[PDB]
Amino acid sequence: DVILKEEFRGVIIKQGCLLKQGHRRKNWKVRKFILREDPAYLHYYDPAGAEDPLGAIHLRGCVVTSVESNSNGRKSEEENLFEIITADEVHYFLQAATPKERTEWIKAIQMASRTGK
Numbered sequence: 001d002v003i004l005k006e007e008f009r010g011v012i013i014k015q016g017c018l019l020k021q022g023h024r025r026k027n028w029k030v031r032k033f034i035l036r037e038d039p040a041y042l043h044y045y046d047p048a049g050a051e052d053p054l055g056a057i058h059l060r061g062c063v064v065t066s067v068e069s070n071s072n073g074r075k076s077e078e079e080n081l082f083e084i085i086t087a088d089e090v091h092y093f094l095q096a097a098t099p100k101e102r103t104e105w106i107k108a109i110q111m112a113s114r115t116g117k
Helices: 099-112
Strands: 012-021 028-036 041-046 050-058 063-066 081-085 091-095
Touching: 012 099, 028 050, 028 099, 063 099, 081 099, 091 099
Parallel strands: none
Antiparallel strands: 012 028, 012 091, 028 041, 041 050, 063 081, 081 091
């Protein structure tokens, strides 16, 4: 009892809608990202119909990097891109509303990823 998913056993670090690279129909989607520490787990929710956590990003062992805007060939959609390289070797391409906020999220995930105990 008084025990739920380890993902949520850590308190919210930072929440805000971000652009998730997801070439299903669009290129970048607008979903709510809520962060949580302790095991380090980032969570994304759909504004249009999924406040249920579609999945958790495994920050434990993840590295973040400031993308030099590798938006080649297309229009510069990927500007304020920051990548999250999980320990699972998955590169998660995220973007913010501003260059400022993505930096804040770089810091967010990196500080949250420190809780890998």
